[PDB]
Amino acid sequence: ECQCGICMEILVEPVTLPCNHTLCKPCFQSTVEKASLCCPFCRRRVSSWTRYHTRRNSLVNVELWTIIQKHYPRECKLRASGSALKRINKELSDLARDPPAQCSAGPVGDDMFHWQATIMGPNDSPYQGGVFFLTIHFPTDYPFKPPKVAFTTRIYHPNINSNGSIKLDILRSQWSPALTISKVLLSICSLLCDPNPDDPLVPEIARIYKTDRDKYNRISREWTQKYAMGGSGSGSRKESYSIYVYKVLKQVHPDTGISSKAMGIMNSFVNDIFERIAGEASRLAHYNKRSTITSREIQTAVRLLLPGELAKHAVSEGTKAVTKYTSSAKAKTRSSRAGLQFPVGRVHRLLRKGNYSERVGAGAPVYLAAVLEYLTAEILELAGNAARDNKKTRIIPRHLQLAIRNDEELNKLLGRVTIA
Ligand SMILES: [Zn+2]
Ligand SMILES: [Zn+2]
């Protein structure tokens, strides 16, 4: 609990500066002794203090060091043996440990430096009942530089403008590494309950808030209604498509099996293709200020990321799936309605879960599921062919690597994925 405000790892050889900020010795030497010679929290000069004590081996607060060592030895010894990414990874764990009320945030797909966040309109405030989405961008120098935070949902606030920019001291001048994204999100919640009209970002809204509060409250609720009516993230657990890879392998090679080690690689392929297409689809949606990812954003992602004929075929399979899905009967399952083996409803959840956008249309998961199915069928067809070469009836990792390397286009697509 008595943690280092920089790295969020248990204080080892804590160093307490004259300003009485404390940071573990590793953080101190890297950020104060090696270059800055200033406190990373309040920026007070500690040059004279650092040189006087480094010569006498008296940087560590012995009293503080002995207490945490006896009380919490396991974490001191675990730690004993980049910084931005790890700090961001520790933030996500902190968010899961003490989830901030009315708030949630998580990375966009597998990109840790780009998060999505939701803020429920605080209770008894004119934004109550609305869900407000925000975009968070962690800089290279995190936590030494602030995170870029902005609203993507329009809101009526004296300190929030049409760009989604948030005028809030801790986001810039008063930012400190000791702050966490959870603390930042809770400060935004307070700002919604108690605007700061005397330091406005939108003077008109501040003047109305200062001279006609009834008006301000009315317009805030109308805006909350018109525009405001985002989770842990993708998580660390690896999804699997074994059920559906098996189904496709049966269609393509009914007399050929696939080993357990090979199936894990197939999952890796499918998960990698999902992440890349959805990630690009997320970029396009944000680029064009669209709240919903649809079949259009998925297609353009496939057109750009897939090579040559794979892209053309995948685009065809995705277009035919959506077309068949729109004309199908409403009663059957979504996968059945699109004529696919891969799970449409499940792909939609994973698209929603990955924080790729505020909303996800019904055509997107159909188009993406059909693309995943097609690419899976191509890999399995070639992998099965590769196995038949070696006089084998069961696909193994070696046959998967062969099929990818022997196909120019698939090698371009999956060559970077590691096969053991
Ligand atoms: Zn530290
Ligand atoms: Zn300080």
Swiss-Prot record:
Phosphorylated by AURKB. Accepts ubiquitin from the E1 complex and catalyzes its covalent attachment to other proteins. In vitro catalyzes 'Lys-11'-, as well as 'Lys-48'-linked polyubiquitination. Cooperates with the E2 CDC34 and the SCF(FBXW11) E3 ligase complex for the polyubiquitination of NFKBIA leading to its subsequent proteasomal degradation. Acts as an initiator E2, priming the phosphorylated NFKBIA target at positions 'Lys-21' and/or 'Lys-22' with a monoubiquitin. Ubiquitin chain elongation is then performed by CDC34, building ubiquitin chains from the UBE2D3-primed NFKBIA-linked ubiquitin. This is Ubiquitin-conjugating enzyme E2 D3. The keyword ATP-binding applies. PROSITE patterns: UBC_1 (PS00183), UBC_2 (PS50127). Disulfide bonds join 103-189. It catalyses: S-ubiquitinyl-[E1 ubiquitin-activating enzyme]-L-cysteine + [E2 ubiquitin-conjugating enzyme]-L-cysteine = [E1 ubiquitin-activating enzyme]-L-cysteine + S-ubiquitinyl-[E2 ubiquitin-conjugating enzyme]-L-cysteine; S-ubiquitinyl-[E1 ubiquitin-activating enzyme]-L-cysteine + [acceptor protein]-L-lysine = [E1 ubiquitin-activating enzyme]-L-cysteine + N(6)-monoubiquitinyl-[acceptor protein]-L-lysine. Interacts with SCF (SKP1-CUL1-F-box protein) E3 ubiquitin ligase complex; when Cullin is neddylated, the interaction between the E2 and the SCF complex is strengthened. Interacts with DAPK3. Interacts with BRCA1; the DNA damage checkpoint promotes the association with BRCA1 after ionizing radiation. Interacts non-covalently with ubiquitin. Interacts with E3 ubiquitin-protein ligase CBLC. Interacts with UBTD1. Interacts with RIGI and RNF135; involved in RIGI ubiquitination and activation. The gene is UBE2D3. It is a peripheral membrane protein. Keywords: Apoptosis, ATP-binding, Cell membrane, Disulfide bond, DNA damage, DNA repair, Endosome, Membrane, Nucleotide-binding, Phosphoprotein, Transferase, Ubl conjugation pathway. It comes from Homo sapiens (Human). GO terms for cellular component: cytosol; endosome membrane; extracellular exosome; nucleoplasm; nucleus; plasma membrane. GO terms for biological process: apoptotic process; DNA repair; negative regulation of BMP signaling pathway; negative regulation of transcription by RNA polymerase II; positive regulation of protein targeting to mitochondrion; proteasome-mediated ubiquitin-dependent protein catabolic process; protein autoubiquitination; protein K11-linked ubiquitination. Belongs to the ubiquitin-conjugating enzyme family. Transmembrane segments: none annotated. One of its GO terms (molecular function) is ubiquitin conjugating enzyme activity. InterPro entries: UBQ-conjugat_E2_core, UBQ-conjugating_AS, UBQ-conjugating_enzyme/RWD. Pathway: Protein modification; protein ubiquitination.
